[PDB]
Design a protein around this ligand. Structure first.
Ligand SMILES: CC1=C(/C=C/C(C)=C/C=C/C(C)=C/C=C/C=C(C)/C=C/C=C(C)/C=C/C2=C(C)C(=O)[C@@H](O)CC2(C)C)C(C)(C)C[C@H](O)C1=O
Length: 207
């Protein structure tokens, strides 16, 4: 018989903006404005904003982002012995790192939260392990681990958690730095062979 059909098409865009002060947010826009007003996420917002990724934050969008306090960046930065400006100007690294900070896996649930339960980030070949301790959600990766200090941030459409430290993907950490942590396991003397991929430390001041 008569078997004929047609294609489909649909799309929309919006750029809302409203600065308010309340315990519960209405949408992503509300969440961002909240963190932006507080210096607690100065560094983070500094990268997230400059990165121009905020555009992704829309309504009816379920996502899990990690907003680590300033101390976090200052910690990992001091330990890695690197410059922030060099990265701030480097869009490549900006999104490269921020990508991991985000979790497209979706709003995690306490019921699903487990010790072995792993989470997949936006960055390919990047995942973290879930850990339960003191009724808190702890994260652990291949290099450097952090713990969620304040979570359950009332948001609209999406959800964000506050961490004390920040985590970085494989390859971003230098050999020397990464070695400092590897030494802990090296002491055992029983693992697989691993080599570097890229180096870092290219920045000079000029007036
Ligand atoms: C862009 C983009 C993509 C990628 C987008 C990324 C990677 C976005 C990253 C966003 C972040 C990281 C947002 C963080 C957004 C973070 C936000 C909104 C954080 C809010 C934090 C708050 C309100 C914290 C509050 C408190 C604090 C901090 C305390 O310390 C307590 O004491 C008090 C209390 C009140 C609990 C894509 C790949 C999908 C491709 C798309 O085509 C596209 O276009």
């Amino acid at each position: 018989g008569p078997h004929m059909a047609t294609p489909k098409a649909n799309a929309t865009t919006a750029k809302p903006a409203s600065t308010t002060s309340t315990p519960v947010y209405a949408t992503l826009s509300n969440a961002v404005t909240a963190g932006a007003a507080a210096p607690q996420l100065t560094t983070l917002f500094a990268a997230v904003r400059a990165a121009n990724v905020t555009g992704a934050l829309t309504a009816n969008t379920t996502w899990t982002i990690l907003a680590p306090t300033n101390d976090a960046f200052a910690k990992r930065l001091a330990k890695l012995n690197l410059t922030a400006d060099a990265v701030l100007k480097n869009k490549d690294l900006l999104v490269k790192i921020l990508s991991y900070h985000v979790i497209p896996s979706g709003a995690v649930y306490s019921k699903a939260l487990k010790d072995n339960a792993t989470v997949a980030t936006a960055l390919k070949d990047a995942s973290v392990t879930v850990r339960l301790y003191q009724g808190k959600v702890m994260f652990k990766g291949p290099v450097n681990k952090a713990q969620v200090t304040v979570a359950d941030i009332k948001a609209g459409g999406s959800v964000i958690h506050v961490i004390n430290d920040v985590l970085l993907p494989p390859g971003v950490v230098s050999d020397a730095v990464a070695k400092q942590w590897k030494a802990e396991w090296e002491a055992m003397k029983a693992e697989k062979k691993v080599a570097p991929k890229a180096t870092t430390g290219r920045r000079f001041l000029l007036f």
